[PDB]
Amino acid sequence: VPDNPPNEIYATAQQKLQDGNWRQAITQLEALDNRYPFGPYSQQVQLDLIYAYYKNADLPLAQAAIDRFIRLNPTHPNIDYVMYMRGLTNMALDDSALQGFFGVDRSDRDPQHARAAFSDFSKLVRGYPNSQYTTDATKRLVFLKDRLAKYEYSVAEYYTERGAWVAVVNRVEGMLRDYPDTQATRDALPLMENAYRQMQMNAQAEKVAKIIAANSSN
Amino acid sequence: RPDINQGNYLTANDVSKIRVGMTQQQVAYALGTPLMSDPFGTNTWFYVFRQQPGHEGVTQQTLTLTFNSSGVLTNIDNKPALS
Amino acid sequence: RYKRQVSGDEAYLEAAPLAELHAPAGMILPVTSGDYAIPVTNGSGAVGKALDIRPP
Amino acid sequence: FVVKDIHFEGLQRVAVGAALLSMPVRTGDTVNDEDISNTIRALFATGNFEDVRVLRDGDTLLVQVKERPTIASITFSGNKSVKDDMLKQNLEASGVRVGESLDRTTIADIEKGLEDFYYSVGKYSASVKAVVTPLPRNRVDLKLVFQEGVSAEIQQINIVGNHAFTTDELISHFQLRDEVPWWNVVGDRKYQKQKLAGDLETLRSYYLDRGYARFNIDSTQVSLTPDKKGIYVTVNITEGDQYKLSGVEVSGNLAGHSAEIEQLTKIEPGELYNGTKVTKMEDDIKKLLGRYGYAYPRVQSMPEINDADKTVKLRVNVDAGNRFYVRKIRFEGNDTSKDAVLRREMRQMEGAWLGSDLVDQGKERLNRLGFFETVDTDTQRVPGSPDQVDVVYKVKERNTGSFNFGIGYGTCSGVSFQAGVQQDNWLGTGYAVGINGTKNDYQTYAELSVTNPYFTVDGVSLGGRLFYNDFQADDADLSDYTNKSYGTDVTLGFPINEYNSLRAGLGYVHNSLSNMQPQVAMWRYLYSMGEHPSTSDQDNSFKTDDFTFNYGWTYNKLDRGYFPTDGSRVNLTGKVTIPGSDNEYYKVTLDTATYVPIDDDHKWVVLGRTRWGYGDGLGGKEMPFYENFYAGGSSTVRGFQCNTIGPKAVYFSDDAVGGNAMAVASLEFITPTPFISDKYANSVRTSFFWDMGTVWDTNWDSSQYSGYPDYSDPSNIRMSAGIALQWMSPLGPLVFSYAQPFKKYDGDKAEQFQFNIGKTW
Amino acid sequence: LFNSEEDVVKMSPLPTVENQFTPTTAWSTSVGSGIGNFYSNLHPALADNVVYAADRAGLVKALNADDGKEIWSVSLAEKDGWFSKEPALLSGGVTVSGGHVYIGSEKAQVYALNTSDGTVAWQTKVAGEALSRPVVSDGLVLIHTSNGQLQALNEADGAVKWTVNLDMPSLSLRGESAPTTAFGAAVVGGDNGRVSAVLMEQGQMIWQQRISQATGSTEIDRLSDVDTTPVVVNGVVFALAYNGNLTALDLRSGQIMWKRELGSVNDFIVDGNRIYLVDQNDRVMALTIDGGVTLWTQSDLLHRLLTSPVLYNGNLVVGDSEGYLHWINVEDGRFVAQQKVDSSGFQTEPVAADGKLLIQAKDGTVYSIT
């Protein structure tokens, strides 16, 4: 990479970002970080570095730079954008493979990334509730709650299959405690009603059948 | 080949320790904490001792405690084995 | 691997809405914690494949 | 006093506000005569400024300060045994990384820290030099030119003070070595620090296992040669006299299990005191107290030595903690494996009492799954409630796919290639796929396999296979016929006692015979099948399609996987054709191998191998000849040629076709090596053997071919005796054998020397 | 594969030569298996018209003073049967005062064998490996060991008389020495920078001294910090150190009189009012008696693993690793001659006494020079 006055290098960096090619743009943004680090427009350089990291699948450097920006600038006037960027960086990290196309569902892997994304988008939608990122954020939240509840339903399935009948009660009770309004729990109450019968505790099977029958079909 | 245990633990001596009218947390002092509870509003507790090793069938000592809104014990039920 | 671009791009994914669970007469639902509550919101931003993510 | 204005000269990259809020004096406040000493101390404590030059008067606080430059690139070269990444971690731990201001002084400390890291890896004569390159806007390029020098080796591992043993025996169990020849893979001559601290416990466990109780290591010593190459290791000991175990005694909060615990700690009187018996007893009391339902049982064991009659008294003190329950198992780290895979390897079920060893059994099973690089167990506490415990298994995975390759040489297989691809997590679901291909002198075998090791959740496994097989019999010293076959197998398998494994499956096969030379025993079966060609020329063909049914049993109780010394292995494989095909036969084969020791250290073993086989056709159709039995050559009875005992073919000679009844009984005697030094004499197995074999036909008739030797009489037992060696070389497994046929019959071959280099093919 | 990866550190080739002399190997007698590739101090010894050697397998020869034939040969191994032969590991010094040589070992033994027909007089056990030079002082064989136990044995019985316990670090660069006698005062090099001086009779430590500078984190400066061999001149004693200071100590006090920052693990010689030593980097210099100002600093043999100097006929003779003696003069330091001797090398001390030089090789071969 050659050296110039920095305005022309920022100009060709924006030119490389404009055409959709990213692998060259990250080098020029790093050159802006190196040759003139504390220049008068390093904020747009850092935010475009975040955008290039996200659009070119370089997720750990994206996490490092986004925690660096949340350390250095606590009250930037566009902190909602970098909050939304950390939210998308968490949620796009959840797939990280090619399994969505071949035909296998991914709702059985590590669920900690969706939990971190929920912890981000909660602060986003409850901190800056009149920004230009909220309406997509609530949709990502309502997808992520269902994706999180499918994990607990799909471990209660396995413990029904194994025969650890106290564990399915102690998991479906947690599912009814924490996600009381999703789609997975209304498909998980037959597991609890079948699980209470194999312990001969018939004083609660009528209760679970009442809470199923008072609802609709699905 | 499997081996599974399920539920709380009893000793067939701790069941001779609780009294009709025992205050709160003293059944938690002797029997230990409950592992599965009834969450739907009625303040009561369960105790299961399920174990089935080595293709021998199941066995169980299902114990049921029903409490008061205050915290004093009200009623017990000690099933020795499943029907 | 290099198939991270599918979720790396703005590929839209939508699912079913949430319905509050009913309650039969004679009992009560378990008390909810509230760690995963979704507040009511207004306004209309863009949705997937229509939202700019270029910083200003 | 106040200063009117502060002049700063030379601040370019750092901010004026940064320099003003760094030091406690600001632009024009109440000041003192400390600002000279402050500007000495403040700009030299942040690590950003080379030099200061100050002056103070009634008008201007005038400072000239240049800035320390910022690193642009930390580059390395010449790092042979070390890579750049952990060098970067050593630099970031040393204090200087990217985005830091150097001071042009501490580069000697960085070279010293690189010297300490090279001492930690085991290279002593290293020398590194830092190269500084200037660049404008206060930048430095940093280069580290290396000269690593020479690695270290261990000359001798000497032990002084031992009387009742020998110094060339205790080195055989050592992790370290001193000599390694050019025909063994016993280890390496490299030295490491913690290997010594792990090996002193191996020496202590050797001495605490044969009746020595007052044994006490005094001092260890590690010296090195003045040319910085050789390392001399010397450890002192002080051997005590032998001892015996007199009586035991228990005490503690035993939870009403005196008669329960007394039947375990009781042994017979008057035995040699051990170090494995006491620890196995301790762990057994731990396991029994866990199996009743206790969570964390503590058990201590102290001896008291009575040297007046060479006895010892063993006190054991139990301690039963209060019980614990598992409320939530949780897996954090599995990036691509399904959660239903990692929960069938947990012998602690959620919602039960906490077994302190069952978590460790789950950790060992997760290690044995082979998909994972490392696992990490832990234990937390749910707040508020005193006796509810979570358990977290963190995992870090591995690139699951592979690429294996192998060569081998034999005396009746020629060269042999084994190649293929094997994948053990197909998309991370538990399945295992593989494409395999083997080639030797005669048999070419190309198979594809797809298996699921958990059909249900109780260990039942299912597998499927598609296989192609080329058999050119003229290379394998038989009467010539060319057999090309292909088929599919679908099998089950499920364990029944964690030792005995059962299996059952179906299979379709298609066989094509051509280029088949005429004879009598093939053509009787060809008459019985009906399709009779003419006897004249070598041009013929036959096709067949079979539906099959396979069943099998496997008993495998051996004390090791390599060089066993105790136990048995019995395999039983049976095949029946089901009605719906051309051929109607059934075959049963049996393999028993028994290892029995007679000594105490398990170094004088008697080995037995029996190998039995029967088969026959049904309904009048004779059993086909391409499933015949062959016995002889490097596997059953050493000394003869490959596959050459039994009846002989009649052209219309002295060649073999096999038969349909096989009995082989071999007796081996394992002895220690008599010539090699005892430092590594446990990696070469020497044996003598006496072998019997017989293969005989049943459906032969003697009345119609009475000018020929009878083949329906299993009386011509072939006997042999020989000497075999077996070890591991850098080329792979090696087995050598020299036999001598001393009871053979008319029409057999002799091959006195016989060996197998590499893989078994 | 291992050659192309592991790099060569440093070397220097053979210099040229203008002979002025012809060294002729007169003896040329082998002893057996040889000391092998193990660093030790196993050098031959001269006694009354007789030479003695060793083998590090258990063999000890006995030869002439001018011919080179045996006069008695004794093995010291412990043979049990036709299928085994356990080595005895003779790796001490070789010395003789009272008609019976003393040979150290590695199995904590000190054999004592007579002159005429070699048999064992006594045999006892010390606290560890005994790799040092045995040395006599009014009787009282004074063995230094590798556990810091300066043990003392008597003459006709082989009994431990007293024992002084020194200190020891983790890493040592062959911590061993040889005691030196001065009026019943034994000065002894230690193992961690401490020169000691005890009484001969019962073992009272009179004083100690530290003469090696330590400026490391116990793994650079004390990566190795060991002294090798003191020697005594009138009043003042001199001692070396590895990576440290050549100093000079008074006998009663041990005060640091004058230093030179140097380093060695080999012997030296204090004949006349000069001192001739050998650096770690084989820079054979020559210093004054008290000043320490360098007289000459001829160093062409850098990183060649020299052994020791001697004083054969007004000339220093050093060893090498390639079997070459490198005869030098004294007043200038320039070379005199060179001589091919063996294709094995030397790690043992050349021994020059009674107008005779002789040297063992690394293969168990004894040579003498003119």
Short mmCIF file of C-alpha atoms in Angstrom, two decimals, chain D residues 80 112 116 119 124-125 147-151 155-156 158-161 163 166-167 219 221-228 232 234 236 674, chain E residues 5-9 37-39 56 86 106-108 125 127-129 146-147 168 170-174 217 219-220 223-224 242 265 305:
data_model
loop_
_atom_site.label_atom_id
_atom_site.label_comp_id
_atom_site.label_asym_id
_atom_site.label_seq_id
_atom_site.Cartn_x
_atom_site.Cartn_y
_atom_site.Cartn_z
CA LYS D 80 12.55 -22.89 13.64
CA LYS D 112 16.27 -11.71 27.69
CA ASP D 116 13.78 -17.34 28.87
CA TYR D 119 15.04 -21.99 27.88
CA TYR D 124 19.95 -22.99 25.44
CA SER D 125 22.44 -21.33 23.08
CA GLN D 147 20.04 -17.48 15.93
CA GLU D 148 18.53 -20.42 17.78
CA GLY D 149 21.67 -22.56 17.92
CA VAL D 150 21.46 -26.18 19.09
CA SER D 151 18.85 -28.18 20.99
CA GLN D 155 22.98 -38.42 28.00
CA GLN D 156 22.18 -40.69 30.94
CA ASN D 158 21.48 -42.37 36.58
CA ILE D 159 20.03 -43.57 39.88
CA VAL D 160 22.29 -44.05 42.89
CA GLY D 161 21.59 -46.00 46.07
CA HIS D 163 20.30 -52.32 46.18
CA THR D 166 18.93 -52.72 39.11
CA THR D 167 19.51 -49.37 37.46
CA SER D 219 17.38 -35.07 46.31
CA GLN D 221 19.78 -32.93 40.35
CA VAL D 222 19.84 -31.71 36.75
CA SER D 223 23.24 -30.72 35.38
CA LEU D 224 24.33 -29.89 31.86
CA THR D 225 27.44 -30.09 29.71
CA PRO D 226 29.67 -27.01 29.21
CA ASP D 227 28.97 -27.16 25.45
CA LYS D 228 25.24 -26.64 26.26
CA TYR D 232 22.73 -35.25 33.06
CA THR D 234 20.61 -37.79 38.81
CA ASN D 236 18.96 -40.05 44.97
CA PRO D 674 17.56 -62.68 26.01
CA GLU E 5 16.60 -28.07 10.42
CA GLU E 6 18.98 -27.68 13.37
CA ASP E 7 21.47 -24.96 12.48
CA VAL E 8 25.21 -24.80 13.10
CA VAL E 9 26.12 -22.19 15.71
CA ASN E 37 30.82 -39.74 24.63
CA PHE E 38 30.51 -38.70 28.27
CA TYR E 39 32.04 -35.67 29.95
CA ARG E 56 34.78 -46.28 32.12
CA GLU E 86 26.83 -54.90 34.36
CA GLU E 106 29.28 -43.19 39.44
CA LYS E 107 27.66 -45.76 41.76
CA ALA E 108 29.04 -44.06 44.92
CA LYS E 125 30.19 -45.61 49.77
CA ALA E 127 26.55 -39.82 49.70
CA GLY E 128 26.20 -39.60 45.92
CA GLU E 129 27.95 -39.62 42.59
CA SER E 146 27.76 -34.17 43.28
CA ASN E 147 25.55 -33.74 46.35
CA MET E 168 23.25 -26.58 45.63
CA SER E 170 18.70 -26.37 40.56
CA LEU E 171 20.94 -26.20 37.48
CA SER E 172 24.67 -26.76 37.83
CA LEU E 173 27.38 -26.69 35.18
CA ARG E 174 29.06 -29.86 36.47
CA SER E 217 17.02 -14.02 37.29
CA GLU E 219 18.39 -18.52 34.77
CA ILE E 220 20.80 -16.30 32.79
CA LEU E 223 21.90 -20.38 34.19
CA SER E 224 25.34 -21.66 35.15
CA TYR E 242 32.08 -19.63 35.03
CA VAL E 265 35.49 -24.42 33.43
CA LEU E 305 36.38 -27.00 22.85
#
